[PDB]
Each structure stands twice: as structure tokens, then as C-alpha cells.
Copies of this chain bind each other. A is one copy, B any other.
Amino acid sequence: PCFNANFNKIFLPTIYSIIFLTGIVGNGLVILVMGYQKKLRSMTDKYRLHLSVADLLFVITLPFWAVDAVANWYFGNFLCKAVHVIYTVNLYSSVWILAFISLDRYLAIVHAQRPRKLLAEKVVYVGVWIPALLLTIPDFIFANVSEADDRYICDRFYPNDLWVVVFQFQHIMVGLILPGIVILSCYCIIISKLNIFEMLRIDEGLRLKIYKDTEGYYTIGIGHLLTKSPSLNAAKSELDKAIGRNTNGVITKDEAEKLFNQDVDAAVRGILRNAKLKPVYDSLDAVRRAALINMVFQMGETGVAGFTNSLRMLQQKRWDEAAVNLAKSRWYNQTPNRAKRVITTFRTGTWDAYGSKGHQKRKALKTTVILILAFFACWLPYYIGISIDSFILQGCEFENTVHKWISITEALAFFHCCLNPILYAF
């Protein structure tokens, strides 16, 4: 004995039908709106449509799940294998696409050359789509239609419990453990690496030890002067006066930033006194004010004041027009690498020319974190359900409620298909 659920034959078909409509409309929109019209697309937005294709592929099989619940399984043997294969493919792909999104996001922040084009355009197939299909061979073989309880039951029939043990471990590892670690690794490094200081760290360079400037003068950090003396020990004492701790050579990056802020305060005060630069600076925004400071740090205030027409256009909010003027200048002729990045900051009013953290880029990353967590949040209650009864085998009274919740939680977990389209909305 202990080899009947009234409520689950009204809950499950409603939940499947709901996810089916929301999935087919939601995702199908993603597929049509990006798939075709969209021309400026992100690396995340490329994986999000790859993910949308995967979630659409599964939602299409949902009508079969609803019929199999309320009534018999009429669809035959091939469709039993096909419905099992699509679910397998979806399970593996959806999570490992999220692994590629978190992996790409790592290379976007921590490594701002570009081996990301390889990932999104050619690795994604070899690494995600082909293995997901190869992982469907035991679902092609074992899934069959059988007569049980004056009905046709469609599931995977294994010859032994050792096979059940083989495939359950392969699913826990490949489906959840293996990408979960990859996903955690990327975000652990991202949050470890995580504005104006960073800009001048790239442009003027950072040195955490006393060096000889190009005109014979002792400096430390981003060209911060200590004293006016050709000796070595006289400048070493001047550091402790500002820093407040004994160093004897080596200084940290955060003590340096302290000296850098003292020089930015100085650059601002000087700009505010210079009659030509003062009105334009006040009209500019924090991002663009930081670009003007980059120039002032370079050739001085008199040099930046020399760009007459460029200044008025910046106040007149003409970024596109003031851009070509600085390319003809002596500043572009000398150092063209630094010059172009400063003009791009004036052009866009963003930290994009400097790459990684910035404003729009943080929001773009927050979007990626929400999606990944919400995906795990869907599957989480069901995992405890595998886990509780996954080890079982107290009594039949409690075992009836366990297997009941595993049906509900898997059905509610399918909301992960509706996550990506809902996230794009508003």
C-alpha cells in the first residue's frame, strides 16, 4: 500500500495557463522588439533575448502540462520525450545564460580589451546551447508513456534507482551548483573592485612612492608637490604633515586620494577666481566640471583660458560644436590619447570614456543583479521540496503534503519565464 489530490487539479492548470499567456506575450514581445527592430543593443540585452528564446520554447509546451494535470495524457510517445527535452534544455540554458550575463558584466567592469564579442556572438552556442541539448539524451531515452491508474502517465522510467541517483546529482550540479558558483564568483570580484580620482589615475597616472618629476621636483600620488628642494629627506617629512602617519616610503591609495581632494579643492578655488572660466564652470554639471578640472591639471589655468570660443559654446550647451575646436588645438597635437577622453566627457556628460562605474552603468548592473536573484527566488522553495522528500526513501500523512507542495512550488517557479519581460516594462 501507499503507492488523490482534488485542489491540485484546479491550482496547477490555472497557474500553467497564466504563465503560458504572460510568457508567450511577454517573451514574444522581447523576441520581436529586440530580435528585429533594435539596432543599438547591449551585451546584456543580447543574452536577455537568448534567454527570452529559451523561456518562450518552454511556455509553448505548457498547454500539455495543464491537460496532463486535469485529465489524461493523450499526446503520445514522441511528444512525451519532446516535452521532457524542452524542459531540460530550458532548465540548463536559462541559468547558464544568467552565468554568461554575470560573467560578461565582470569583464565589462573589472576589465574596462574586449573578449566579450567572442562570448555573446560565438561562445554562448558552444558553451550553453550545444551542452544543453547533449544533456537531453537521457531524457530522450528514459521518457515514455505508460498505463497506470486507468490513465496514461508520461514521465522518465529508469531501470534502477542508481540511474535516478546519477541524473539527480548531474542536475543539482550542472543545473544549480556549477553556475551558482560562476555567478557568485563574478559578483564577488565586481563588488571588491567597486570617480574624479579614477579619471586622473588613468590620464595623469598614479605612483604610490616619491619620484622625480620631469622638471626636477619631488612629487607623490597624482603629481602632488611636497616641498621646493632638490634633497630627498626634506620632502619625506612634508608627507607626514598632511597624511598624519609614519610611512618611510610606501603610501596607500586612500591616503593618496586624500592629497588629490586637497588639489581638486585648489583647482576649483582657482577656476572660481579666474574671470573667464568662473561663469562657464557654474553653468556646467558635476561630470563636465570634473572634465574642466582635468584640463586645468594639465597645462594650467592660462592654457585652458586660451580656448576662447570653446568656453562660450560649453556654457551655450553646445557639446557637439565645442568638440571639433579642441581637436585642432596644441593639446590634441601633443597627447591625443588623453585629449579625446576629456572631449568625450564634455560631449556625453558621462563617465563612459572611462568605462566601468559611472551612473547609467551602475543602474545597468543593478538590473542584472535583480534578475539573477529573482530567478533563484522562484526556484528556491521547490529546492527545499526536492531536498526534504528528495532524501525520503515520518509517514504517509506527511508525505502526501510534501509531494503536494513540490507540485505547487515547481508550478510557481515557472514565473522565472515572466521575469525578463516584466523587468523591461516601465
Contacts and interface: CB of A to CB of B under 8 A. Distances in A.
A332 to B, nearest CB: 9
Nearest to A162: B165
Copy number in the complex reads: 2
A170 B162 CA distance: 14
B393 A162 contact: yes
A165 B166 CA distance: 7
Contacts of A278: none
Nearest to A174: B173
A113 interface: yes
Q: What are the 9 tightest A-B residue pairs by CB atom distance, in nearest-first order?
A: A162-B165, A165-B165, A169-B169, A166-B169, A165-B166, A212-B336, A161-B162, A173-B173, A162-B162
Contacts of A169: 166, 169-170
A327 interface: yes
A183 to B, nearest CB: 16
17 contacts: A111-B113, A161-B162, A162-B162, A162-B165, A162-B393, A165-B165, A165-B166, A166-B169, A169-B169, A169-B170, A173-B173, A211-B336, A212-B333, A212-B336, A230-B328, A231-B324, A231-B327
Interface of A: 111, 113, 161-162, 165-166, 169-170, 173, 211-212, 230-231, 324, 327-328, 333, 336, 393
Contacts of A231: 324, 327
Chain A binding surface SS class: helix
Most buried by B among A111, A165, A166, A328: A165
Contacts of A393: 162
Contacts of A328: 230
A231 B231 CA distance: 47
Given A161-B162, A212-B333, 5 more contacts: A162-B393, A165-B166, A166-B169, A169-B169, A169-B170
Contacts of A170: 169
